[PDB]
Amino acid sequence: SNAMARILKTAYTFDDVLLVPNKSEVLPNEVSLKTQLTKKIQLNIPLMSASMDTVTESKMAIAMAREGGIGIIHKNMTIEDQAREVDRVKRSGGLLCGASIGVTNDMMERVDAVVKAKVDVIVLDTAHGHSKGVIEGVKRIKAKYPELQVIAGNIATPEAVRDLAEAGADCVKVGIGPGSICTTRIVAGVGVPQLTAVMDCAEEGKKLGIPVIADGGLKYSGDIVKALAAGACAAMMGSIFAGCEEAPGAIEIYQGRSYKVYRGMGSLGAMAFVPEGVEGRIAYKGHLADTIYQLIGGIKSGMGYLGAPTLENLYENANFVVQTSAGFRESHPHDINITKEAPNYS
Amino acid sequence: ARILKTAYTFDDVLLVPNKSEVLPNEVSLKTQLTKKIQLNIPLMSASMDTVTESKMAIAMAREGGIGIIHKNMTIEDQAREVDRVKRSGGLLCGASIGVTNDMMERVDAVVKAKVDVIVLDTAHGHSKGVIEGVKRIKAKYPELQVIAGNIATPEAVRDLAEAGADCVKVGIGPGSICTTRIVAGVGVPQLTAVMDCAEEGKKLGIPVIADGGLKYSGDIVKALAAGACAAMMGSIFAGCEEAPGAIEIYQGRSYKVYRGMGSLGAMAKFVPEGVEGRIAYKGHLADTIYQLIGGIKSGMGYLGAPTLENLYENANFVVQTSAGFRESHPHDINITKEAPNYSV
Amino acid sequence: ARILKTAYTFDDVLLVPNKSEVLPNEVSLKTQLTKKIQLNIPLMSASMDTVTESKMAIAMAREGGIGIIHKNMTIEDQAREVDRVKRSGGLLCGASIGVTNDMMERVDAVVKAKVDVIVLDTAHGHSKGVIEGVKRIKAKYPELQVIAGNIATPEAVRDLAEAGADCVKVGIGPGSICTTRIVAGVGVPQLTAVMDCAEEGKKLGIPVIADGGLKYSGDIVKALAAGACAAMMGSIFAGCEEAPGAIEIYQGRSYKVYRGMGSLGAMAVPEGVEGRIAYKGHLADTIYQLIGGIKSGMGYLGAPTLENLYENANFVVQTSAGFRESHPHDINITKEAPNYS
Amino acid sequence: SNAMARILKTAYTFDDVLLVPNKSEVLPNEVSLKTQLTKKIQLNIPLMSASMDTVTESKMAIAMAREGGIGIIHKNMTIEDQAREVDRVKRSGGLLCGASIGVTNDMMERVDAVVKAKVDVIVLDTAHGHSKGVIEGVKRIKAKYPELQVIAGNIATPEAVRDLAEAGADCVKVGIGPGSICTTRIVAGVGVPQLTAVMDCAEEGKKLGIPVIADGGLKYSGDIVKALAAGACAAMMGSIFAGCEEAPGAIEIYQGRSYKVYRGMGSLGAMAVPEGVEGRIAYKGHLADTIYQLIGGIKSGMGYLGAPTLENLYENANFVVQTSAGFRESHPHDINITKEAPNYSV
Ligand SMILES: C=C(C)c1cccc(C(C)(C)NC(=O)Nc2ccc(Cl)c(N[C@H]3O[C@H](CO)[C@@H](O)[C@H]3O)c2)c1
Ligand SMILES: C=C(C)c1cccc(C(C)(C)NC(=O)Nc2ccc(Cl)c(N[C@H]3O[C@H](CO)[C@@H](O)[C@H]3O)c2)c1
Ligand SMILES: C=C(C)c1cccc(C(C)(C)NC(=O)Nc2ccc(Cl)c(N[C@H]3O[C@H](CO)[C@@H](O)[C@H]3O)c2)c1
Ligand SMILES: C=C(C)c1cccc(C(C)(C)NC(=O)Nc2ccc(Cl)c(N[C@H]3O[C@H](CO)[C@@H](O)[C@H]3O)c2)c1
Ligand SMILES: O=c1[nH]cnc2c1ncn2[C@@H]1O[C@H](COP(=O)(O)O)[C@@H](O)[C@H]1O
Ligand SMILES: O=c1[nH]cnc2c1ncn2[C@@H]1O[C@H](COP(=O)(O)O)[C@@H](O)[C@H]1O
Ligand SMILES: O=c1[nH]cnc2c1ncn2[C@@H]1O[C@H](COP(=O)(O)O)[C@@H](O)[C@H]1O
Ligand SMILES: O=c1[nH]cnc2c1ncn2[C@@H]1O[C@H](COP(=O)(O)O)[C@@H](O)[C@H]1O
Questions:
Q1: Which residues take part in binding K(+) (chain A) (predicted)?
Q2: Taking CB atoms and an 8 Å cutoff, what residues of chain C touch B62?
Q3: Which pick of B46, B294, D146, D168 has the fewest CB atoms within 10 Å?
Q4: Ligand 7 and C45: CB distance under 6 A
């Protein structure tokens, strides 16, 4: 007869999908990477460094802003220190600066301090943004500071986009469990594969007039293209920047190789417990400028392939196909002994 | 001969976050193992001669869960193990029973030791022997709580509930030490088996246990969200200090023995349906339970669930590919520090 | 002026045996000192300058209990002492705090050293100084576990709980070296004090410590059965090798110094005396005997655990003739017993 | 000078030699391990823990003394902290205690403080004990504190035993370059293989009535037996003790293995060009379990040599040299070892 079936939707990450080429009348050197992070704030490139104590303090935020993106100063420091870090960025030539805020008893004291330091945007930043504490936190902050730009996260559903927008958020940050250092999905069982999360959240954001950020799980420049084509206004990265000279931490040498420490903000070491992150090391990659150069070149390439002179046109005309694990093997270089370094592929 | 659908295990799915007004410290983990038996936490140790004797059962009960004393010992020895648990403070205790000639003698002895629940536990619970065993036990001991298993279908839930079972145990082939699916070709991926059976149990008012295949705390959250009243583990507890067997050292690492009850070694106490081996020593049970419970409480916070029933009622799963699985785990990082709830 | 009732000490009372299904060896002695601090055995060493420094505190923690480092030293030294215990491998450690001008700066240093619990310890814990002290410490360190004492009434339990104490310590005048009752006229016999204060603490969810007056392992059973979460001892531990002070010999007998912190010596109108007690050797040997006697009593009371012990505790009062029956009598004891005088 | 460079002889380490069994009328349980560390200090067992900041503080010294040996508190701390450390050991039951001293401008100030804390022996301890600084230091200390017992080192020649004895040392410590964490021989080219160094220095020491300590390079209990049979009054170990619970440092876990930090005092990290390295060794649990194995091995060796006492062991010990082929025979060979032995690893 006609049978009863279990309805379970498949959700996709970046490695599950590829963008289909469009007719193109634009060369990659003709495209524009400008984006609205919020209605108020424009970025020259759609890239953000993560608010992590192994990724962004003022050194990284200054370099990020000079490249045309933005850094979010992490909050694993006293209120006074975080205000000093923001102020250091703001004093370095009018550069944009963000600051992370938690759902804490001293939440507004921290907001007041970074506001006095002239922070451009705050990120009310929690493991579970679709929550009463974040919703009320946003309302409180916007009641006191109606023109202060507020990003709220992290979330993974359209319903969360709508609730945080109604609460007064100027932008929402998408990502539950995709981070390279993240164990949320493993230890709590919860998350949404990040390409689907970004797509579904950005679609709701577009209807509401609120942008969304694709936060976490990005490894290659092509991953960022997919996130922007899916509708994200900007991409946030920890792992891709944590090995740069401008990130916190010393350069460590071991058996002829250079490393920097990178760790989840929910790892034991960062929290110092039931942790939701791990602690480790990644390759030292040198100055941020050289990593940004490769990322931008890759984004401009993808836009050339899709005929997009702007990021809005990229989203409007992007079509995806799903690839299998065998397609993934074809997409990567295969059947070759790679003997020389490539600046954008490892 | 027909292909019904794709069936999923825990690693195939993820739970979607819900709007939440409850923090992880505000949630309740209480659960009805049967209508008569409540657990403070939804966790059980397996009835395996390398997992649960009285030492483990006492520890499990003091943590709020329950141990099932295995049956690879004489009847008198199993009765004395149960008795040691019950005298240690009215702690809950279970006991495994097989489909054997002396089945009722063994039931009589653990009933005398005041066991709270027996598990009539077989490779194939959806069988005449188990059905007739449950009916015989309930006829002599109408109020004795009986778990029957193992099973993997809604039909088996119906047939065991009709026989008189107060709870049914799901899992055909998911065990870490299990070769049933390989040697016999039979089984149902465990997440689908639990969703299918727990939905059937809910209609009939009979709880179901998610037994086998659990590796991380998030796997338990998925099993509870799918509707199981409790989760049963061998591998996760077999390395604990309270499990049977000596701590053994090999090249600077501490190990304990862990084996299937259908392995040659356990049956010798011949076509086996299990293997024998070693897993890492984990220290005291309390530290493992703390991580499991913290992960469960975190998952319930993400789903806005103050109770296990609300967790089930509002749980939505999505399927992830193997690319999604690689994103879900830590990736592109050389991990250099131990984490207490994650290993690779 | 009114006489409320007769009040009892440990020697006034005996526990009635219950039907039991537990052997002593199967018993569990874990207890919650506070909501956050669990002990494997319900025993604490007193914060006196002849009982607990880091050496004693480490030994107590290794045995499953805890030691409270006395405050008769500079702030810097007491932080060093706490430091030494905490760096000795994740052992629990407490520290004494007084109602003093430098109270918060002493608290600041011991929390810096990662003390697990503070004891705001005065002669009269039911006082404005202690109540406001507790309030000040809790406002600055909301997570810091705080024991407040000493007290002897349920009203004091209620007031210190409302001030934010996580545990209260009971004992006005029972100490072996104490003269408070003789010089001030004030105190409550300790078994009644513990039972009346624990009853109020149970209703508020706040544990009580039975501090002082314990001589034998059976006394500890009575204090725990009366409702205390833990027993604190000075005299029983002062003769152990791990307590401060040298071993002194006289007439073929070994002794150690033991004195009240309100005695003239310690303060250099006293409420304590100074003297000597027998050397007992290593703490481990004393703890073993205390734990054996406690497990024996719980066996007799059918209590596999300590909360069940309070619930099922029935005392009878004995006379001085009953007391003479309870002790060995009409025997010339010729052999030493490890748990009896 | 008309002298010329020359090659003197072949020199041997412990792995180069074996002790020949003697006629025995003594069982291992009948032998006595007592030894004179100096004319005034007797030890119940001939074992010492090294004065390193990853081996011996008050906890280790207390446990070593409880076992019948002695610990030397390291000097990588303020004078006050080292006096406090000696004080903790002394008040723990009158246990023996040692303390390290360097050739520094504040040498006498440090000596004064540990003397007040009632230290039983100081070790004037430098990379090159056969030097003017150490000789004058010993003389200066012996002038102010004639009764204070003084060990001086490290040395590797009979001439150095003679000169330190003439300066007033009560005991000399032998070892240039044998340490597990030592690179002196690699970076400076200097040292003497430790068995020959101990044998030759102990020969001079017995002629002058001054004991000598065998410091460094010991890995197995049988190595201690060789060092004592060569005439050392005691054996000093860093590596064998650094993994014990009583040594300083946290227990680190990595891939199911427990570790403790161990590093040379001449390494970059401890100095805070190097002559040591920094690393990790296996965690061993409590000192008592390690001592038990070492003492049992020593007693067994004394049984094999019919020695009821350490002086008898030395008087009647005969060595043979083994080749690298004899060494392969001496270790287990041609076996897949499947069970841990408590006194044999790798
Ligand atoms: C990025 C991640 C994963 C991370 C970073 C640093 C730390 C963490 C840790 C490891 C601390 N885990 C969580 O915090 N787990 C969590 C789970 C469920 C829920 Cl519901 C919540 N609630 C959150 O939102 C509430 C306000 O509404 C707050 O109380 C806040 O706790 C948290 C995780
Ligand atoms: C958990 C596993 C896999 C396991 C544990 C220990 C031992 C076993 C062994 C290795 C013995 N294999 C089975 O027993 N294989 C089996 C296969 C098909 C069927 Cl139908 C049955 N029948 C079962 O149910 C009947 C009730 O009537 C019983 O008589 C009983 O025989 C068994 C396996
Ligand atoms: C008897 C013991 C344990 C002892 C220990 C060391 C020393 C002492 C000495 C011998 C010094 N005697 C007292 O101190 N006697 C005393 C009597 C009555 C009162 Cl009311 C108070 N003080 C109270 O007044 C403040 C009111 O806010 C509170 O903070 C609280 O300190 C003290 C005695
Ligand atoms: C145990 C070792 C190897 C060690 C431990 C910690 C640190 C060191 C360091 C790495 C510091 N290296 C030396 O110190 N190298 C050295 C080489 C040749 C000579 Cl001659 C000397 N002179 C020494 O003896 C003189 C007595 O007067 C002193 O002045 C002193 O300088 C030293 C090494
Ligand atoms: O410990 C954590 N657990 C889970 N997610 C984390 C944790 N710390 C940081 N994150 C998230 O992971 C992102 C970085 O991911 P990555 O670019 O893939 O390394 C951050 O921007 C946060 O959204
Ligand atoms: O040898 C056997 N073959 C198949 N399943 C077994 C065998 N022994 C135990 N089991 C099952 O495996 C479960 C433990 O699975 P684990 O938690 O994944 O190690 C037990 O609770 C039993 O249900
Ligand atoms: O001099 C004092 N006067 C009154 N009580 C004191 C004095 N010094 C210490 N105490 C108390 O007496 C207890 C020890 O009593 P013991 O165990 O009977 O020796 C300590 O824990 C304090 O509560
Ligand atoms: O960094 C250093 N370089 C050379 N020798 C050292 C250094 N640090 C300690 N030592 C010596 O090495 C000994 C320990 O060697 P082990 O017992 O073989 O590990 C110590 O007792 C010192 O004599």
A1: 177, 179, 182, 330-332
A2: 28
A3: D146
A4: no
Q: What is the dihedral of CA D339, D342, D343, D346, to 10 degrees?
A: 40
Written as six digits, the tokens of A344 are: 């954008």
Provide CB contacts within 8 A for D316, sequence distance 6+. Answer: D22, D305, D306, D307
Say whether A328 sits in a helix, a strand or coil: helix
- Residues of chain C contacting B89 with CB distance shorter than 8 Å: 28, 304-305, 308
Residue D112 burial by Cβ neighbours in a 10 Å radius (0-12, 13-18, 19+): middle
CA B239/CA B220 separation, integer angstroms: 18
- Distance (Å, whole) CA C57 – CA B254: 31
Asked if C122 and C99 touch (Cβ cutoff 8 Å), the reply is: yes
How far B8 CA sits from the closest chain A CA (Å)?
A: 10
As a whole number of angstroms, the distance between CA B169 and CA D201 comes to 75
Indicate the DSSP class of residue D268.
Answer: T
Q: How far apart are the first and last CA of chain A?
A: 52
> Using CA atoms, how far apart are residues D304 and D309, in angstroms rounded to an integer?
13
Q: Would you say B299 is a known binding-site residue?
A: no
Crossing angle of the two packed helices A194-208 and A221-229, in degrees rounded to 10: 40
Are the C-beta atoms of residues D285 and D245 closer than 8 Å to each other? yes
Catalytic position from the list D182, D201, D233, D244: D182
Distance CA A27, CA A25 (A): 7
Would you call B87 and C304 a contact, using CB atoms and an 8 Å cutoff?
A: yes
Nearest CA in chain D to C89: D250
Helices (H), ranges, C125-252: 128-140, 154-163, 180-183, 190-204, 217-225, 235-238
CA–CA dist C146, D153 (Å, integer): 51
Question: CA A319 to CA A17: how far, in whole Å?
Answer: 10
Q: Taking chain C, what is the end-to-end CA distance rounded to the nearest angstrom?
A: 41
Nearest CB partner across the interface for B17, out of A12, A176, A196: A176
Q: What one-character DSSP code corresponds to residue C11? A: G
Characterise C58 by phi-psi region: left (phi > 0), alpha (psi -120 to 50), beta (else).
alpha
Q: Which two tokens stand for residue B58?
A: 């006492």
C55 in contact with D at a CB cutoff of 8 Å? yes
Identify the DSSP state of B288: H
Would the CB atoms of A190 and B17 count as touching at under 8 Å? yes
Residues 295..314 of C with a Cβ closer than 8 Å to B: which?
A: 304-305, 308
- Asked whether A194 and B327 are in contact (CB, 8 A), the reply is yes
Write out the two tokens for D199: 């044998």
Experimental method: X-ray
Q: What is the C-alpha to C-alpha distance for residues D210 and A88, in angstroms, rounded to an integer?
A: 66
Contact between C22 and B88 using a beta-carbon 8 Å cutoff: yes
Burial-class residue D133 by CB neighbours within 10 Å (0-12, 13-18, 19+).
middle
CA C100 – CA A64 distance, rounded (Å): 52
- Residues of A annotated as part of the active site: 182
Contact B117/B146 with Cβ under 8 angstroms?
A: yes
Of A165, A173, A115, A105, give the one whose Cα is nearest residue A138.
A165
- Nearest C-alpha neighbor of D217 from the set D280, D154, D129, D144: D154
CA distances from A157 to A15, A39, A180 (A): 20, 22, 21
Query: In chain C, which residue's Cα lies nearest the Cα of D62?
Result: C55
Residue B172 corresponds to which tokens in the numbers above?
């055909």
From CA C153, how far away is CA A307, in angstroms rounded? Answer: 83
Cβ partners under 8 Å of residue A88, min gap 6: A58, A62
Residue closest to D174 by CA, chosen among D220, D212, D210, D204: D212
Residues of C in contact with D93 (CB under 8 A): 241
Domains and CATH numbers, chain A: 1-346 (3.20.20.70)
Residue B133 parent element (H or E): helix B128-140
* Contact predicate D248/D263, CB 8 Å: no
